[PDB]
Design a protein around this ligand. Structure first.
Ligand SMILES: Nc1nc2c(ncn2[C@@H]2O[C@H](COP(=O)(O)OP(=O)(O)O)[C@@H](OP(=O)(O)OP(=O)(O)O)[C@H]2O)c(=O)[nH]1
Ligand SMILES: [Sr+2]
Ligand SMILES: [Sr+2]
Ligand SMILES: [Sr+2]
Ligand SMILES: [Zn+2]
Ligand SMILES: [Zn+2]
Lengths: 48, 49, 99, 90, 1342
């Protein structure tokens, strides 16, 4: 089968990040959502 | 399957190609009467109706 | 074995045997050559439509026998009607064009 | 003709055209009345139609001439109705 | 104009548009749902639906609120279901909206790729983009990448940073759709035609022409390359892929339903993933399987192989429904179930007539079931249909009376499996007989391959008046007394009938009652049945015979004839319009068959049918009166059987002494010992025909012994009723020789006959041939059945179009003579054929024989007295008749007594006439007439032995008679011995020239000793056995099987004198060294002295497969070399043992050269004037080479003669007209030389170019005369080139044809016979031919 082989080869290039490497990405997620939440708070219609 | 009287002679087209004649005595005397037992099944089934 | 009319199969609307009456005799392509070699045209027409797959053909022709008409009045056989939908489902346009 | 049809084939020509000519005559005797030209000594409609070809009483030419007459006889005996209809349409 | 009329004439196939798919659809399938587990009903918007496809019940809604047939076409507001019949679920379709564009498998994987050829890109480059591995460039400008460039992710990243914006490149199937979007079809065709001007090429030109042929066909139809990638996917109706509850309770679903679910599932997931965060890795992988999901749905057997959810089987895809030996396209012909049909075991019917059959009572009541109900309510016996049903089931006495009335005058067809020819289905008028078995007429049983031992026949009943008439006028046995294969009658008495007439006509020495005068043939019956005279003995009888008058009929000649009592009674059976001389002789199968053949043309069709039955009735009666019985005493053994055997038994032991001594070698013993037993087997067989043939001896009148034996076995053999002379050999005389598993014949044959007890070893020996011969018979029907299938598919679409074709051109017909014996005379060959040119032969005074007329059986008799030779008659090959045969310029119908009427399919009869009897599948010139041998171009040289061997390439033989004229013409090849030289008188029956038929000898010029220079044993030459001279001889091997040690060695014989020096060849001072080619066999040894004329070395050159090989036009292993251009031709240069032929005429240009293999022996030496089509290498000729040079006439007669030679040896009679029909189907499709309208190569029909050339040279604005060369295509090479996609996909590969028809946009107008069988329309042949002409004429006007 073809579709089974190359899928394992696409994610094979991407290496696993562990421990404190996961937190580095996780910190950008929560700071990314908070920046959006700051933009909604600044908008006057959102309060209305 | 029993044995009968056999005569190798042409007839009036009743033994054209491999065809074999029989006497009424073959039918009268049970010499080629075969018994056949047959099975017939009736199944009562449960349906959605 | 002998059959005039009876039950028909689901996927293809051609004769099928099971109960009461026996199954019909298959008219193969070797038998088709014979009628093609002969001047026969209406007999093969019967073998393909009213005796086989044609749904509207068989019942309408059967009533003509009882009435004393002996007329075919053939149409589209179910052997080709299924074939048309199978090509359309592939993604290839197939249509019937008039005169 | 029950056994051989050769006597009827010679009258028209083609064996296939013989079928279509006799089929028109058979269907006329089957549904639309039509009295047999050749004395009906039992037999079915398929053979009686071939009996008329052998004597030379029915043909593709003869069937067309008689169909022209029957169409015009049903036209003249119904002209009274057609003329009335056409007046209301205009 | 009509809009709602469904009467179609043509069907077209093209690519479907995404908007066009929505037109077929009635709703969108968004859910993979089928049926609820609680209530068995369709669900919301799944595969099975009532809102989209239709209601499950007849005229009802899902809930059950809307009931009765009252509501019609009402759209529900509660459910959304249209109140209609459930047959709507069989016609209505759905659609699935794809989130991502997925490619079609039929246009991608199917070779040589429809998407690939259109974009000029290999499949490896397309798949890597589609599969998501690399990017592809669509738009180009100043980005250095131009077009169709494959780029990796790392290459694409750097390329965008340098340029970007204006640069456009996408990834996946979206890129391919965009690539087909941007391409301009109008400008691509202009660029390709410009480049094909200076650089043309030859082999690489084919792929450039392939692109143009694909592009030009794409624009003219208007398919648009954008629809190649699927965006909207159509769905099948639920009825075709059903979920039905079975008898048990477990459901049964189609494999299509399982495939459709695994398409929607990932389609719904992709719609989710595109809005719920889209990482490329997962999104590309979901698009990867979605493309595979459609691929598995359409054609599963291409990319991977899908497995069913519960079963371990490949699922039936959409492509697998059409093809797969048994599908939907192929079941239209073969797998067709038929109503009004019966089947029973066959039985004899001697009391029945030729037009009568013995159909069973209970079968006929079941078959004519609706016919009974029709003529029961009409009579006033039954009230209604249901009351008539009860009368039939109860088997009432009155029903049997009505049943006989309906059956009378109603024909019934009888079919037997298998049908090889058309006579397998014949109509008969049934006679009601009680029993479960069907009775068949003994005479028509010869037409079928039937034997009353356990055979079954299909019983078909026609329904309509048209069907009833074409059964009586065409398919009736009385109308079909002759065979369609040959002019000889097929309905011929056999077995019992032949034996009855044989005993009746044969005479004895002195039987009861002899020397009486007898008043009429009536008194002959008065004596026999009473008991006063026997059937035999020569008794004078008064007879009144009626001969045919010139006008007919008044001739009544009465004379006293010297016949027997039995011959006089049979005259009463013989009709009036037939001579008495035909019944005067002792009648056998050969003689009785001549009676019906003569009775047909002299009287007619009706008189011979009544006579045919009258022979049968009388045949059985007198066969019963005779009382022939096969006894053990009738199996007479020759007087001195073991006496002959003993003379040959120890004669083998005599050569066994030579086996050990060395007089006769071990290899020469086997073929010499076997000749003794072969001569002994014939000696016993000839001695057997003395104690069985004429063994009577005891004669009461006189003292004589000469009489035909009254033995029961000989009576069956001499008459030809049952059992030939070969069968009698094994039973009474000797069985003969048997074969080994290898193929060789066993040393000692079986001496014991079937009269005595065979040995245990002898019986085990005889079993090999029994289990090998019948094993060949088991696959004989399969091989010949495929041969019948092969010949049909190429010639089926051929019918008679015109009554006469305006060409006075045909084929030269000469009686076939092999060496010095006539196989078939002119009468049998030119019978039926219509002449093209008048008879101009002088012999008897007359005013010309008219042309363009049918040659009657009596008209051919006139040509016999005049002795006519070489008559050019109008044939099937030479026809310029649009699309078909031209009736008059063809010949007679063999089944009928006149010309074949227009409309009848010739090609179907022609294929069946050869496929049916296919189941049964010179060296020295001798002169009889006195004269004198005169020789020209003689180069003969006398050798040491005393053989006049000629040293010339071309030699002809001529005879000079008493007056001084040439009598016979014969050709003499190289390496032949002549008996007499120039001007020598010959006697009646003497051989003048002799040579070995299967060899090519090499003759030396100089005399002396033989040297073996460069002839090292083992390295170049090997030792085996020559099978012609023979003994142990050296074999020269070609440059392929030689060892690595001796690479550069030339095999040649050097001629030296007594001293050791070379004897020079007269002419050049070069040493004598004859270079020997490969395969050649050397007979001479080292040191042996030879004279001028001695041979140095000799160079060596089935049944049903042979017939199949000739019809397929396959070239032999060793093709014959022929000269191509006429003129002064000379050889050029040399290599080792080969010559390069340079052919140059006298006129302008003419640049031509040839290359010839080394082992070939030529028929020209140096500086020879050779013509077009001359033999250079002797042996088999290539079918393509004859058409290339000799023309389109010598090749056509080559196919006829070579095929007939196979059937003549087996004993089969097939006319030459049937073969030439298939030949015309081989010659079709021709290559164009001159520029006309489209390309140079291509593929256009001969008549298609003939319509073109007739239109271009006069009008149509072209003025160019397109020159064409005829091409030969052997059946399968011609059957692929049909101008119909419906006809092609029937026997050819389905997926290739349907894709080719879609891209080109082909239209099938339904003209072929096979085309109309599939669609369910009338055949453009026979009865439907007159119907078809009514619609074809109204296409131009309207
Ligand atoms: N035994 C026998 N009889 C033959 C044969 N050929 C013809 N007949 C008989 O001749 C009768 C008429 O046959 P046709 O073929 O119509 O002859 P026709 O045209 O000259 O009248 C039929 O009688 P019918 O069926 O009673 O028809 P009808 O007389 O009621 O019309 C048929 O039985 C034959 O080969 N053998
Ligand atoms: Sr009447
Ligand atoms: Sr047989
Ligand atoms: Sr058999
Ligand atoms: Zn409802
Ligand atoms: Zn012609």
């Amino acid at each position: 089968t073809d579709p089974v082989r190359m899928y394992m080869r696409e994610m094979g290039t991407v290496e696993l990040l562990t421990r404190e490497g996961e937190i580095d990405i996780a910190k950008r997620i929560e700071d990314g959502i908070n920046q959006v939440q700051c933009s909604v708070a600044e908008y006057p219609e959102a309060i209305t | 399957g029993q044995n009968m009287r056999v005569a190798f002679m042409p007839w009036n087209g009743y033994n054209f190609e491999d065809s074999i004649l029989v006497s009424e005595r073959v039918v009268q005397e049970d010499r080629f009467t075969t018994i056949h037992i047959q099975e017939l099944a009736c199944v009562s089934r449960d349906t959605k109706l | 074995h002998a059959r005039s009319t009876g039950s028909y199969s689901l996927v293809t609307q051609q004769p099928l045997g099971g109960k009461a009456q026996f199954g019909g005799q298959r008219f193969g392509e070797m038998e088709v050559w014979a009628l093609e070699a002969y001047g026969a045209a209406y007999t093969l027409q019967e073998m393909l439509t009213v005796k086989s797959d044609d749904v509207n053909g068989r019942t309408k022709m059967y009533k003509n026998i009882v009435d004393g008409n002996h007329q075919m009045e053939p149409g589209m056989p179910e052997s080709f009607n299924v074939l048309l939908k199978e090509i359309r489902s592939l993604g290839i346009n197939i249509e019937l064009e008039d005169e | 003709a029950r056994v051989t049809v050769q006597d009827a084939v010679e009258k028209i020509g083609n064996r296939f055209d013989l079928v279509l000519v006799a089929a028109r005559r058979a269907r006329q005797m089957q549904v639309g009345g039509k009295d047999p030209l050749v004395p009906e000594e039992n037999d079915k409609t398929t053979v009686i139609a071939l009996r008329e070809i052998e004597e030379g009483l029915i043909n593709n030419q003869i069937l067309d001439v008689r169909e022209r007459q029957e169409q015009q006889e049903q036209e003249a005996a119904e002209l009274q109705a057609v003329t009335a209809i056409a007046e209301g349409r205009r | 104009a009509q809009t709602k009329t469904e009467e179609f004439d043509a069907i077209k196939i093209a690519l479907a548009s995404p908007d066009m798919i929505r037109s077929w659809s009635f709703g969108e399938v968004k859910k993979p749902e089928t049926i609820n587990y609680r209530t068995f009903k369709p669900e919301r918007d799944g595969l099975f639906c009532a809102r989209i496809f239709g209601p499950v019940k007849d005229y009802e809604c899902l809930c059950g609120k809307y009931k009765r047939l009252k509501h019609r076409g009402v759209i529900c507001e509660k459910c959304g279901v249209e109140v209609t019949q459930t047959k709507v679920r069989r016609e209505r379709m759905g659609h699935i909206e794809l989130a991502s564009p997925t490619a079609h498998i039929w246009f991608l994987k199917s070779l040589p790729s429809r998407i690939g050829l259109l974009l000029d890109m290999p499949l490896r480059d397309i798949e890597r983009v589609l599969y998501f591995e690399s990017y592809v460039v669509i738009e180009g400008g100043m980005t250095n990448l131009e077009r169709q460039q494959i780029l990796t992710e790392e290459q694409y990243l750097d390329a965008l940073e340098e340029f970007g914006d204006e640069f456009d490149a996408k990834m996946g199937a979206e890129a391919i759709q965009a690539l087909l979007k941007s391409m301009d079809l109008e400008q691509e065709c202009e660029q390709l035609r410009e480049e094909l001007n200076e650089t043309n090429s030859e082999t690489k030109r084919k792929k450039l022409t392939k692109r143009i042929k694909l592009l030009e066909a794409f624009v003219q139809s208007g398919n648009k390359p954008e629809w190649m990638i699927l965006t909207v996917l159509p769905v099948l109706p639920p009825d075709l892929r059903p979920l039905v509850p079975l008898d048990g309770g477990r459901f049964a679903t189609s494999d299509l339903n399982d495939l459709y679910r695994r398409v929607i599932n990932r389609n719904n997931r992709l719609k989710r993933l595109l809005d719920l965060a889209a990482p490329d890795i997962i999104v590309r992988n979901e698009k990867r399987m979605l493309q595979e999901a459609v691929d598995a749905l359409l054609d599963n057997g291409r990319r991977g192989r899908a497995i069913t959810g519960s079963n371990k089987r490949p699922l039936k895809s959409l492509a697998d429904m059409i093809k797969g030996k048994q599908g939907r396209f192929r079941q239209n012909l073969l797998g067709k179930r038929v109503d009004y049909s019966g089947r029973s075991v066959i039985t004899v019917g001697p009391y029945l007539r030729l037009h009568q059959c013995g159909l069973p009572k209970k079968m006929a009541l079941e078959l004519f079931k609706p016919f009974i109900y029709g003529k029961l309510e009409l009579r006033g016996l039954a009230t209604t249909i249901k009351a008539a049903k009860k009368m039939v089931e109860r088997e009432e006495a009155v029903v049997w009376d009505i049943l006989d009335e309906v059956i009378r005058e109603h024909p019934v067809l009888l079919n037997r499996a298998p049908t090889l020819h058309r006579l397998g289905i014949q109509a008969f008028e049934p006679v009601l007989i009680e029993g479960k078995a069907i009775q068949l007429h003994p005479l028509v049983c010869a037409a079928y391959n039937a034997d009353f031992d356990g055979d079954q026949m299909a019983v078909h009943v026609p329904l309509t008046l048209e069907a009833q008439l074409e059964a009586r006028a065409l398919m009736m046995s009385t109308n079909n007394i002759l065979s369609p294969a040959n002019g000889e009658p097929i309905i011929v008495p056999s077995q019992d009938v032949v034996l009855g007439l044989y005993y009746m006509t044969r005479d004895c020495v002195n039987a009861k009652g002899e020397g009486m005068v007898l008043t009429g043939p009536k008194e002959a019956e008065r004596l026999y049945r009473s008991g006063l005279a026997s059937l035999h003995a020569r008794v004078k009888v008064r007879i009144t015979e009626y001969e045919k008058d010139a006008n007919g009929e008044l001739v009544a000649k009465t004379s006293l004839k010297d016949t027997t009592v039995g011959r006089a009674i049979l005259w009463m059976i013989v009709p009036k319009g037939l001579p008495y001389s035909i019944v005067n002789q002792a009648l056998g199968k050969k003689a009785i068959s001549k009676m019906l053949n003569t009775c047909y043309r002299i009287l007619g069709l009706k008189p011979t049918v009544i006579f045919a039955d009258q022979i049968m009735y009388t045949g059985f009666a007198y066969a019963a009166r005779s009382g022939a019985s096969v006894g053990i005493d009738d199996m007479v053994i020759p007087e001195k059987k073991h006496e002959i055997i003993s003379e040959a038994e120890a004669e083998v032991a005599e050569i066994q002494e030579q086996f050990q001594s060395g007089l006769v070698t071990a290899g020469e013993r086997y073929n010499k010992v076997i000749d003794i037993w072969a001569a002994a087997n014939d000696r016993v067989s000839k001695a057997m025909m003395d104690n069985l043939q004429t063994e009577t001896v005891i004669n009461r009148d006189g003292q004589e012994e000469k009489q035909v034996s009254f033995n029961s076995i000989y009576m069956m053999a001499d008459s030809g009723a049952r059992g030939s002379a070969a069968q009698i050999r094994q039973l009474a005389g000797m069985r003969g020789l048997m074969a080994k598993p290898d193929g060789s014949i066993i040393e000692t044959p079986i001496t014991a006959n079937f009269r005595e007890g065979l040995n245990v070893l002898q019986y085990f020996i005889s079993t090999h041939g029994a289990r090998k011969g019948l094993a060949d018979t088991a696959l004989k029907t399969a091989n010949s059945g495929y041969l019948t299938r092969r010949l049909v598919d190429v010639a089926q679409d051929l019918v008679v179009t015109e009554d006469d074709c305006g060409t006075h051109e045909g084929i030269m017909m000469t009686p076939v003579i092999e060496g010095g014996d006539v196989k078939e005379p002119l009468r049998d060959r030119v019978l039926g054929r219509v002449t093209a040119e008048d008879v101009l032969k002088p012999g008897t005074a007359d005013i010309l024989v008219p042309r363009n007329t049918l040659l009657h059986e009596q008209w051919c008799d006139l040509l016999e007295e005049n002795s006519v030779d070489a008559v050019k008659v109008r044939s099937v090959v030479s026809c310029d008749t649009d699309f078909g045969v031209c009736a008059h310029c063809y010949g007679r119908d063999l089944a009928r007594g006149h010309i074949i009427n227009k409309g009848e399919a010739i090609g179907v009869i022609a294929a069946q006439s050869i496929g049916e009897p296919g189941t049964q599948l010179e060296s020295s010139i001798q002169v009889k007439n006195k004269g004198s041998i005169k020789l020209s171009n003689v180069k003969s040289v006398v050798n040491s032995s005393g053989k006049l061997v000629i040293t010339s390439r071309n030699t002809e033989l001529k005879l000079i008679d008493e007056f001084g004229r040439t009598k016979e013409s014969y050709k003499v090849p190289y390496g032949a011995v002549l008996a007499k030289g120039d001007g020598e008188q010959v006697a009646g029956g003497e051989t003048v020239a002799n040579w070995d038929p299967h060899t090519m000898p090499v003759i030396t010029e100089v005399s002396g000793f033989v040297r073996f220079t460069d002839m090292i044993d083992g390295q170049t030459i090997t030792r085996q056995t020559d099978e012609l001279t023979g003994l142990s001889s050296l074999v020269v091997l070609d440059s392929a099987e030689r060892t690595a040690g001796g690479k550069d060695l030339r095999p040649a014989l050097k001629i030296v004198d007594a001293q050791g020096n070379d004897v020079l060849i007269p002419g050049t001072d070069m040493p004598a060294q004859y270079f020997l080619p490969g395969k050649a066999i050397v007979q001479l040894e080292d040191g042996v002295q030879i004279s001028s004329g001695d041979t140095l070395a000799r160079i060596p050159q089935g049944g049903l497969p042979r017939v199949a090989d000739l019809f397929e036009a396959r070239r032999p292993k060793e093709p014959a070399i022929l000269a191509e251009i006429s003129g002064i031709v000379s050889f050029g240069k040399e290599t080792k043992g080969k010559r390069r032929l340079v052919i140059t005429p006298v006129d302008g240009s003419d640049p031509y050269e040839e290359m010839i293999p080394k082992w070939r022996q030529l028929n020209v030496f140096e500086g020879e004037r050779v013509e077009r089509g001359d033999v250079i290498s002797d042996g088999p000729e290539a079918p393509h080479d004859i058409l290339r040079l000799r023309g389109v006439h010598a090749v056509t007669r080559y196919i006829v003669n070579e095929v007939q030679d196979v059937y003549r040896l087996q004993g089969v009679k097939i006319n030459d007209k049937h073969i030439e029909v298939i030949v015309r189907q081989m010659l079709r499709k021709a290559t164009i030389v001159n520029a006309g309208s489209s390309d140079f190569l291509e593929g256009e029909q001969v008549e298609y170019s003939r319509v073109k050339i007739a239109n271009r040279e006069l009008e149509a604005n072209g003025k160019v005369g397109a020159t064409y060369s005829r091409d030969l295509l052997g059946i399968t090479k011609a059957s692929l080139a049909t101008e119909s996609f419906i006809s092609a996909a029937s026997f050819q590969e389905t997926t290739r044809v349907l894709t080719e028809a879609a891209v080109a946009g082909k239209r099938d107008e339904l003209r072929g016979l096979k085309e109309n069988v599939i669609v369910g329309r009338l055949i453009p042949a026979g009865t439907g031919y007159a119907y078809h002409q009514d619609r074809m004429r109204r296409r131009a006007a309207g």
